[PDB]
Amino acid sequence: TGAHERTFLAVKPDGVQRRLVGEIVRRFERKGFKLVALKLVQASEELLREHYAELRERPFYGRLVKYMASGPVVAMVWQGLDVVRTSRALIGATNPADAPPGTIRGDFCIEVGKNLIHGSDSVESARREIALWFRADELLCWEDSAGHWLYE
Amino acid sequence: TGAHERTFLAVKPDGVQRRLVGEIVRRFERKGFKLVALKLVQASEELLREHYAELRERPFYGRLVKYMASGPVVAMVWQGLDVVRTSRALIGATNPADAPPGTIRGDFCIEVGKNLIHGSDSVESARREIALWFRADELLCWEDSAGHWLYE
Amino acid sequence: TGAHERTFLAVKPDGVQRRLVGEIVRRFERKGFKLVALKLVQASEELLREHYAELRERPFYGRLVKYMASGPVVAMVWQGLDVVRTSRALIGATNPADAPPGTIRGDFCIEVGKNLIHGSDSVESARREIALWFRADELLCWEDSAGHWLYE
Amino acid sequence: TGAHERTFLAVKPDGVQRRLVGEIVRRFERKGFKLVALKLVQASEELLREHYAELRERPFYGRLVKYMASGPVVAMVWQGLDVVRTSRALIGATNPADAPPGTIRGDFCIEVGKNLIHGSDSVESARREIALWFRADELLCWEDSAGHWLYE
Amino acid sequence: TGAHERTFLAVKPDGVQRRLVGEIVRRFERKGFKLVALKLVQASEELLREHYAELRERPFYGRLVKYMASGPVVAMVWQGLDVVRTSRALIGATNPADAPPGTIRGDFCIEVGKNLIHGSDSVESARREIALWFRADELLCWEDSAGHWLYE
Amino acid sequence: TGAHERTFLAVKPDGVQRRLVGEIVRRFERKGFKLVALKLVQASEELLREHYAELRERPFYGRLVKYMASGPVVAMVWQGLDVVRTSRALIGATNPADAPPGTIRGDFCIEVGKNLIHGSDSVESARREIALWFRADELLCWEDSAGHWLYE
Numbered sequence: 001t002g003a004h005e006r007t008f009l010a011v012k013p014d015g016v017q018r019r020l021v022g023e024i025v026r027r028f029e030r031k032g033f034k035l036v037a038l039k040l041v042q043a044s045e046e047l048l049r050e051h052y053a054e055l056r057e058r059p060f061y062g063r064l065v066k067y068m069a070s071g072p073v074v075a076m077v078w079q080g081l082d083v084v085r086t087s088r089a090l091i092g093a094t095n096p097a098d099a100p101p102g103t104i105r106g107d108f109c110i111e112v113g114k115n116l117i118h119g120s121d122s123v124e125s126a127r128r129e130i131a132l133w134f135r136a137d138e139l140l141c142w143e144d145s146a147g148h149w150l151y152e
Numbered sequence: 153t154g155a156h157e158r159t160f161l162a163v164k165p166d167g168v169q170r171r172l173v174g175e176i177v178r179r180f181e182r183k184g185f186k187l188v189a190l191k192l193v194q195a196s197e198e199l200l201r202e203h204y205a206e207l208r209e210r211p212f213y214g215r216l217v218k219y220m221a222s223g224p225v226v227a228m229v230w231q232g233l234d235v236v237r238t239s240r241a242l243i244g245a246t247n248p249a250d251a252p253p254g255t256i257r258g259d260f261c262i263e264v265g266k267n268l269i270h271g272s273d274s275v276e277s278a279r280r281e282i283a284l285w286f287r288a289d290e291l292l293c294w295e296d297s298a299g300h301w302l303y304e
Numbered sequence: 305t306g307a308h309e310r311t312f313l314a315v316k317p318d319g320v321q322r323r324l325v326g327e328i329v330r331r332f333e334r335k336g337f338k339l340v341a342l343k344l345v346q347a348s349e350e351l352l353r354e355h356y357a358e359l360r361e362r363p364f365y366g367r368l369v370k371y372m373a374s375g376p377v378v379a380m381v382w383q384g385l386d387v388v389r390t391s392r393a394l395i396g397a398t399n400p401a402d403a404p405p406g407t408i409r410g411d412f413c414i415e416v417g418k419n420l421i422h423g424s425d426s427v428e429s430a431r432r433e434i435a436l437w438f439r440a441d442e443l444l445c446w447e448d449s450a451g452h453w454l455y456e
Numbered sequence: 457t458g459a460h461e462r463t464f465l466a467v468k469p470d471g472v473q474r475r476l477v478g479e480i481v482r483r484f485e486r487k488g489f490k491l492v493a494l495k496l497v498q499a500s501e502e503l504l505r506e507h508y509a510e511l512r513e514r515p516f517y518g519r520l521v522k523y524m525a526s527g528p529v530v531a532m533v534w535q536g537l538d539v540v541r542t543s544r545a546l547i548g549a550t551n552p553a554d555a556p557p558g559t560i561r562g563d564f565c566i567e568v569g570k571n572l573i574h575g576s577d578s579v580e581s582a583r584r585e586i587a588l589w590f591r592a593d594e595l596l597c598w599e600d601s602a603g604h605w606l607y608e
Numbered sequence: 609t610g611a612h613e614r615t616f617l618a619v620k621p622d623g624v625q626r627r628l629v630g631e632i633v634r635r636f637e638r639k640g641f642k643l644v645a646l647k648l649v650q651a652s653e654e655l656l657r658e659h660y661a662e663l664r665e666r667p668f669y670g671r672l673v674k675y676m677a678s679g680p681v682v683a684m685v686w687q688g689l690d691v692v693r694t695s696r697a698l699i700g701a702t703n704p705a706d707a708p709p710g711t712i713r714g715d716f717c718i719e720v721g722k723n724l725i726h727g728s729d730s731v732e733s734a735r736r737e738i739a740l741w742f743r744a745d746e747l748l749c750w751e752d753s754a755g756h757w758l759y760e
Numbered sequence: 761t762g763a764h765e766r767t768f769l770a771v772k773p774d775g776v777q778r779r780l781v782g783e784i785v786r787r788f789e790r791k792g793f794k795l796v797a798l799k800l801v802q803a804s805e806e807l808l809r810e811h812y813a814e815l816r817e818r819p820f821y822g823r824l825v826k827y828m829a830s831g832p833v834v835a836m837v838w839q840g841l842d843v844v845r846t847s848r849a850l851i852g853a854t855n856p857a858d859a860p861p862g863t864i865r866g867d868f869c870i871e872v873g874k875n876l877i878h879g880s881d882s883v884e885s886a887r888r889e890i891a892l893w894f895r896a897d898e899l900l901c902w903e904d905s906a907g908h909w910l911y912e
Binding site for chain 6: 014017018063097100101102103106107108109110111113114
């Protein structure tokens, strides 16, 4: 949907525990993306098994699920042009060792299991993840007055 | 409840529009309070009339309600010692003209109608506001590992 | 003029030298005031003797003038409600020893001679200072799109 | 001129509108470059047609000129070693989608039409741009006391 | 000694644990004070009983000593005009509930037992504390090039 | 030693002079590494000749040694997984002209002689540098409570 593209972001429990929710939000705000959904939730194992369904035969899958249910996450939807790809970029490589400073993981994380945040890896994944984590009435349209200064 | 005291905060639509959600969250995080609930909602006029029920005979009540329903707000619950009173302090006086720099309003706001954020003004108000805006299953207990360094 | 009130600010040479121009500007921006004039100039002794004409029989007047002409200053005009009084507040007491942290002087300055910035001390002073330092065609009207979120 | 090299920077109207002037200035300050000229101006279409003369057969040229005249810009000259090339780097790729986080565009911009700032693309361009936008008596020499700690 | 006045600061173990050492240092740097001594130490109970000798009949004394020996502290000496009194101010009231936002405790602390930092409360205390915690050859004179812009 | 790896960092005198000690510390803190040693020292020429022993036939060696002894440095040891390599990365290329924004040198430095900080370039170098600059009883173990949220 061009500038109506959406991605799903989740601050993982390490993010909440280390108090970096604000910091992360702020990076998306100042980049100019539009916050259209935000919930602090304790994810169920049922949901997380579906979230991570593509990773079900990998050896990390049990621990990854038990982890993401271990604490509160902050679930989020961000809207704007190319937001999925750009989010991946702001966040940085999956392994923080490969995430250059300036990215969230580059700045704040050391190890791949405690890398602070999930972002949808494709427009497809975002559609699925958004529907899985959020009811349609939790996604907000609002008239974004900043948008005259972010888009032509 | 001592260190289990809770207060309700809401970023008003100006806060969302001006992109200060992250900024505000970050101030509460770094102060050490524990985020126990968070959503982005479009508040109904029905809810807001109950929220602002103590102010129903003042002349600004209608416009205040029509305002807070004008856009998305970010509703929030924060937990910690004396959190209600301390929140009021971080936020600053209701009229920003009286809010000393260092406070959120002192730093970011000019006029009382566009003062960015609501905080519960008493323990009583917080009880009511929390119940009004949030179901009990939206408030999260999580084992706060920072708390050994915030409380004796 | 209400929300059209204007004040004159000058980053003094210490501010420029210590690299705090951006920092200071940013505080005014984020407070919500509207930047309507800005130049980097070397003030002449003639101008500064008139600028500081109220202080001409104090013993320190010579040194204050020779100082402010010692380097580049950043001259500025800021517009908004109560901007003169609020600027005085953001800046802090004239002697930084009396300027509480959170204010510019409270955060960045130690001694009264090197207190980083001048702000008009009254609406009267601002009228005079603005005319003294700036031609009318250097003050800009621009359609401030943030203003819907700072004023009612 | 080595460490006397100069580049022309302009905060575009989006930068002013979004209140990022201070932020941008501050990045140049803290990098260690020396601010030698600064004004807030409303650029004329005549000037901007000459400024963007190299881009006169591109399809974006009309809209780019009408844009940059649409609002106030902050025009700037920065001095230091390799300042032109390094400015290009701090700013980031022309298309923000290609600008890595840590750069100004990477951090703050989404689309190429609203990319916040112009920087001279060569020493040649800077010479021309500086003369076009600034009288010689607007460029200041000042004894930079930080410079002992930026240059060997 | 005027502008040669010195105070002793210690980031307490909560400050180290919560990762606020840099943050605290930065506040003193940007205020303009001169760092003349710095080490990370594990304080002995013997030292701490002497450090807190003024507080020996209060009921909190045992726990305060066992606490400050519980972890690493960052010991510091800062030099400049009125630095003792001004430090007390930047830090904020002993009980953070009384520390206004903008101060370190106001911004970062909730409870008096975990208030992040100690600062000498008098010139006398600073003399004693500096000698107790630091050898004379750990205090550095260095030619402070910023000082021409902090003092007249 | 895995997550017990250590690196030696030194803020060079330019760092101290330009007041960026806090800033630098803060970057390491927020990345999650563990500060295990810290002092402000005036390095002797004898020590620095040993520190820079690998560079003894290069033409810059005399000036490099006379420089690093010219003022106070802040010596530091940081512990965590891959801390040596990651420190190199946070710091940026040796020549700041090649250091992308987001890195310390990319953000703060212009020229190679005044590039603010040294970091060990290998685990080997760190072992040597740590022993050269620090007694064993200056390196602290402390029970890092943040570590559950940085490592699995």
